[PDB]
Amino acid sequence: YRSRAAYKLIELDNKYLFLKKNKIILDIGCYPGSWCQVILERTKNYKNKIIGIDKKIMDPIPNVYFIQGEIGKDNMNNINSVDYKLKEILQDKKIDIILSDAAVPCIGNKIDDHLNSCELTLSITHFMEQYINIGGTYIVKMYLGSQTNNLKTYLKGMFQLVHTTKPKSREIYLVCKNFLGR
Numbered sequence: 621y622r623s624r625a626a627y628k629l630i631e632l633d634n635k636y637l638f639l640k641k642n643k644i645i646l647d648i649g650c651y652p653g654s655w656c657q658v659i660l661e662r663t664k665n666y667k668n669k670i671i672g673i674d675k676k677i678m679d680p681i682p683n684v685y686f687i688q689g690e691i692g693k694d695n696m697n698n699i700n701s702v703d704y705k706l707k708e709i710l711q712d713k714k715i716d717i718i719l720s721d722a723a724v725p726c727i728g729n730k731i732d733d734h735l736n737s738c739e740l741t742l743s744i745t746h747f748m749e750q751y752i753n754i755g756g757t758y759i760v761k762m763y764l765g766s767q768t769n770n771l772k773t774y775l776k777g778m779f780q781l782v783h784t785t786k787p788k789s790r791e792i793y794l795v796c797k798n799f800l801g802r
């Protein structure tokens with residue numbers, strides 16, 4: 621694995637079992653690429669499309685589509701470039717599993733870092749809503765804090781179920797199952 625972050629995705633998929641055959645999968649904040657590697661392993665003899673997005677250029681991985689871009693900036697609809705690159709890949713399809721291991725640099729003021737994390741989470745969520753397939757899974761990392769539950773409740777407005785994982789500036793994942801729309 622290119623990063624020890626791979627083991628976080630292994631843990632997530634072991635518990636929540638979302639990596640399945642015949643799914644289109646997007647990995648946001650993919651650099652240097654270990655989640656992409658885990659996704660490849662777990663879907664080894666399956667038909668899938670695996671897409672990675674990061675503002676940093678990732679070294680290519682065979683059978684993974686990479687898109688350089690900052691979600692919240694390089695996609696057009698926020699609170700063209702990423703969108704048109706997705707269009708090339710997806711055509712008329714939406715994305716079954718959207719994962720985000722993205723994070724904003726810490727300034728060393730806990731509350732500000734949490735608010736910044738909220739802002740990033742909202743940007744990624746706004747982008748997710750455009751591209752997620754009905755029935756799709758969305759998992760997003762954030763710094764746990766005062767607004768986490770607000771965000772969880774917001775997500776419960778568009779998914780059948782939303783779970784907060786165990787904290788690990790502590791970080792959690794919001795695991796969202798079965799996109800239903802608003």
Ligand SMILES: C[S@@+](CC[C@H](N)C(=O)[O-])C[C@H]1O[C@@H](n2cnc3c(N)ncnc32)[C@H](O)[C@@H]1O
Pocket residue numbers: 622623625626648649650651652653654655656673674675676689690691692721722723724740
């Ligand atoms: C911890 S790294 C991800 C490690 C990755 N999951 C792996 O296993 O190789 C977090 C990444 O999020 C990216 N990132 C932060 N904000 C982003 C954004 N708005 N859009 C795309 N990527 C972003 C960073 O550039 C960074 O590479």
